[PDB]
Design a protein around this ligand. Structure first.
Ligand SMILES: Nc1ncnc2c1ncn2[C@@H]1O[C@H](COP(=O)(O)OP(=O)(O)NP(=O)(O)O)[C@@H](O)[C@H]1O
Ligand SMILES: Nc1ncnc2c1ncn2[C@@H]1O[C@H](COP(=O)(O)OP(=O)(O)NP(=O)(O)O)[C@@H](O)[C@H]1O
Ligand SMILES: [Mg+2]
Ligand SMILES: [Mg+2]
Lengths: 606, 606
């Protein structure tokens, strides 16, 4: 049948590209600098084969001159420029990107990496300007003026009233009556620092005597190998990408080659606030709101990532959904894990790294599952054998005897409450080391690990059993069977406050304590859960080697299982053991009342 | 001078709209259903003036008949259809939207609201298909076939081998090999539920026996009159917009007819979800990730918002930054405040609502400032006179005596620990009501309020002054200096644990108590801060009329300022006051050992 070619309504496509493509109206400056950088890259590539191309204009720069008295923001560069034909075919045709044609026409293997590849970015200037007066000048042509008012047609006339420029393009922007904000120095500097910070060419800005100030003093470091970059340059780079005042603690500069090519310079700060990783394609900032490239627990680091094969959208403000995001996320996680392992080789630097980002590492163990074993070796806690220095789990399993098959730890509110806990005497009598956990997020990660190099993590606050000789077990069972009336009477006294009352030999000096029941929340977990602003079973055991329990035993033998004088004593002892174990004290008024009664008894007053 | 018209490269403009824009590949179905809905709206408006237009096909529907045998996802509708000239200019031209041409040619007082306003949405089908065969049929022309290969030209041939449809368009989408996922019923139903759920015209889908199933069974309610909607319809609408299984508690259906006309049906769930509010433009879901649309503390509210004059971008997945979302946020906040006030008029309804979203309201008092006084009326807490039922702040200040100027409250870990706290007897003697704060987020709101109807919020756990008579102030000053040597000796024993020790008359039944101070954190605030997963000063007081303090007074009169038996009592009583006030002990081992010493002394243990 009949065949027709596709057409495009210019009077509607122009408004479609200008108004309904870009969300913000400040990226017009970023696109103009990107076009100027592409022109300078073209004239530089032409200068490598012919040095006479820079005789007219030797300096390569981009000059921006705001004029509030004339309502014009001029954009002047010293690039290759546009001839009479380029002002019609390249600049006058929508979706025509001559920068793409220049990139595909050069010989394979060039070092240049230009930015423009769509062909409609130049029309973004009309979002803040009504009429434009772009002036071009090429070495192989005269000086012309490209005038437009975002209408249906454009006018190109020979320049005979303006100054004779050497080489480059002068983009005269007549701003609208409601877009005068872009004539201020602070607004221009903010747009540059946000979108046009790491351009390879100097961005000169005319500020008020008139002077020129460069807005891109900091050069990108991802274009150089990590072998010839000093630490001060890394500190300046970190202070430039972020508003932080302190130098980065550690820098990780890697480069992945092969099917995916991308470079990233990830920095580790010196403090924690309790996204951050910027994305750069063709030396231009695209977006920083992609949460899928970096995990939430790992979002404490700062830095930028440079790439060239990312499928950028038309607006150049973000990227499409692709499978490369998972690849770059895995690479960043692996490189940061390697960086953490390198920091672990040092003692002074890793101390600051752990004291500043312990929560992030412990979160990495809690949520993440693939790198859980790698992050478990970075945990540092105190123990009975290490009171001052922090000891890892790798050094913990080395000091474990041949008969110990489990890793013992303990949680609590503070370090002073767990260092003198009544659950440590039994483990120290057997020369068993017990770790110390003082942060509320420690148990959230220890409940996910449940194993380290084959050693099961056992919490001493919960119920647990220890191996012993058959003779000791036979003697302990014959002692437990005779304390049975005491535990039975004490259970009836406590009522439903505890699950059961059994004799425990894991207490030497403490008279009694309350443990957990191997399941549910522990003594510290329920305290953390009942204290969150945005958001189990207990067992009472006594020690048969304490004089207090020995005196309580002879009370039920004479018929004192239901006396009124003993009830006050056993209830107060239960609430005291409840406090020393880490549980929540319900109704402290009766506790204080009984305490005051003993005070009166000790002060000889009734 | 030389004037030239703007041009557009077809081979590049097409590629611009095939990879850059429409970052998601599943929205091709949404756009095609929107085009079918526009065609049906056209034929429905044409039927209002000529009923004979629907004689060829009376039914109005969109049929989705997948065919995995030949890898085609054909979409058939019964809209107005396109003629021979419409398949060239309306469909074959980029950025040409005949739907906009039909909208601008509408009569005065039209009611139809069509979706098509750009003209590039039809070309989104090439994201998953390599070639299309659009079969159109209009009442004023013959049945033609519009074929394309996503290249630079298209072919239009007269239909001779396909079905002789009555009226509408048939779009044969030959899906690519890597995009065969859209041939299953699950993917089609998910895309329809995500974007094309609330289309006014029925969407038919062939599920393979060949049977048809309507996907858009839930009709929208924002177009109908809110006063005519029943509760079951609101429940069914809530079950469709959200995956929740519980019925909505309260529904707020309002419509603002100001400078920006928009409809919104906000629902109140029954459980806290710890975005949620979806945005619709002309019965089309665009996005649900709007930040400025709803505050953070208000994210628990579910519902949808329908607007018409919104700056839709090219991809129709976000709004442009035109500073128009602030008025929508303000209207939503105001309407939900009115909704909460209406819920407060009912007893059982507000009891069910406050029991599920108390933290959300308290967080709203914490961060929000413009509606802080409005949200303060919804705060419900217990008190000494309201131990059973909840009481607001208005009912609290109405029962305040004429000589009370401050609102007294108390915070603690639980309600049983604050109902008998020794800080209540001082206010109970003056017949002053004291609120009970049992949640960790209550102080974060009470610190931001600081006042309610001129009454200053004063925490009784902190240092505060009570009004007294000169006859009582005289005897208080006479007895304060009498106890001064006891306080000096007690401070010398306590050391740096407390700042100062003052004889406070705000204690009647307790021998002593400890407070934080006048400024800074409270007793429970520092405990919550030290118990958070992502994350002081003390003033000691005594009661001069207690037998314990009266006996301790005579101890220092005989030279007992530095005895060995008084320091044990001093430390023990200090930790007891530290317990009853809501703090945490420095070490429970020392407290447990001291209590065990009392037990040995009481049990005559030598
Ligand atoms: N300042 C300039 N100096 C010289 N040539 C320029 C300048 N600005 C634009 N051009 C030319 O005009 C063409 C049109 O560019 P433009 O419409 O901005 O889109 P693009 O830069 O080519 N691709 P993109 O940046 O992704 O939108 C460029 O390819 C250059 O050849
Ligand atoms: N199924 C259809 N039946 C009849 N006419 C149709 C159909 N699909 C598209 N058209 C016509 O083709 C035109 C092109 O529409 P399209 O390219 O999809 O963008 P649009 O819908 O007009 N505007 P937008 O939805 O914002 O992209 C429409 O305006 C209709 O006039
Ligand atoms: Mg450009
Ligand atoms: Mg469309």
């Amino acid at each position: 049948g009949e065949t027709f070619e596709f057409q495009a309504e210019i009077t509607q496509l122009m408004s479609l590209i200008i108004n309904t493509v870009y969300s913000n109206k400040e990226i017009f400056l970023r696109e103009l600098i990107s076009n100027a950088s592409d022109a300078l890259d073209k004239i530089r590539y032409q200068a490598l084969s012919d040095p006479k191309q820079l005789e007219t204009e030797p300096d390569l720069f981009i000059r921006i001159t705001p004029k509030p008295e004339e309502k014009v923001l001029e954009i002047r560069d010293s690039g290759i420029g546009m001839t009479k034909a380029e002002l019609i075919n390249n600049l006058g045709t929508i979706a025509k990107s001559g920068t793409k044609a220049f990139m595909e026409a050069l010989s394979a293997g060039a070092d240049v990496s230009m930015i423009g590849q769509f062909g409609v970015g130049f029309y973004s200037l009309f979002l803040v300007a009504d009429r434009v007066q772009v002036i071009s000048k090429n070495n192989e042509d005269e000086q012309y003026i490209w005038e437009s008012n975002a209408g249906g047609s454009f006018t190109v006339t020979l320049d005979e009233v303006n100054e004779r420029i050497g080489r480059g393009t002068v983009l005269r922007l007549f701003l609208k009556d409601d877009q005068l904000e872009y004539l201020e120095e602070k607004r221009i500097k903010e747009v540059i620092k946000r979108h046009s910070e790491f351009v390879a060419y100097p961005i000169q800005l005319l500020v008020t005597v008139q002077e020129l100030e460069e807005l891109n003093k900091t050069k990108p470091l991802w274009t150089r190998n990590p072998s010839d970059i000093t630490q001060e340059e890394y500190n300046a780079f970190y202070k430039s990408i972020s508003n932080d005042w302190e130098d980065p603690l550690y820098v990780k500069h890697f480069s992945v080659e092969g099917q995916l090519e991308f470079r990233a310079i990830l920095f580790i700060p010196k403090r924690a606030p309790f996204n951050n990783i910027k994305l750069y394609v063709r030396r231009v900032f695209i977006t920083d709101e992609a949460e899928d490239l970096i995990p939430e627990w790992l979002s404490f680091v700062k830095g930028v990532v440079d790439s060239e094969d990312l499928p950028l959208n038309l607006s150049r403000e973000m990227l499409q959904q692709n499978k490369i995001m998972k690849v770059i996320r895995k690479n960043i996680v692996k490189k940061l894990i390697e960086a953490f392992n390198e920091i672990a080789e040092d003692s002074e630097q890793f101390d600051k790294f752990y004291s500043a980002f312990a929560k992030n590492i412990k979160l990495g163990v809690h949520e993440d599952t693939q790198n859980r074993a790698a992050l478990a070796k970075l945990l540092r806690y105190n123990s009975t054998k290490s009171v001052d220095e922090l000891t890892s789990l790798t050094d913990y399993v080395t000091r474990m005897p041949e008969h110990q098959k489990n890793i013992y730890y303990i949680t609590g509110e503070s370090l002073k409450a767990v260092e003198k806990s009544p659950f440590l005497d039994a483990l120290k009598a057997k020369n068993f080391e017990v770790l110390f956990l003082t942060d509320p997020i420690d148990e959230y990660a220890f409940t996910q690990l449940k194993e380290f190099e084959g050693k099961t993590l056992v919490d001493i606050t919960k119920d647990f059993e220890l191996e012993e000789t058959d003779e000791e077990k036979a003697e302990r069972e014959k002692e437990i069977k005779e304390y049975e009336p005491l535990t039975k009477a004490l259970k009836d006294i406590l009522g439903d406050q505890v699950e059961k009352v059994v004799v425990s030999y894991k207490l030497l000096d403490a008279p009694a304590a309350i443990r957990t029941g191997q399941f549910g929340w522990s003594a510290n977990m329920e305290r953390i859960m009942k204290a969150q602003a945005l958001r189990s079973k207990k067992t009472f055991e006594i020690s048969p080697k304490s004089p207090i329990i020995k005196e309580l035993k002879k009370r039920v033998d004479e018929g004192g299982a239901q006396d009124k004088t003993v009830k006050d004593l056993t209830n107060l002892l239960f609430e005291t053991a409840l406090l020393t174990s880490g549980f929540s004290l319900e109704e402290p008024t009766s506790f204080a009342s009984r305490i005051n009664r003993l005070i009166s008894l000790g002060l000889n007053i009734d």
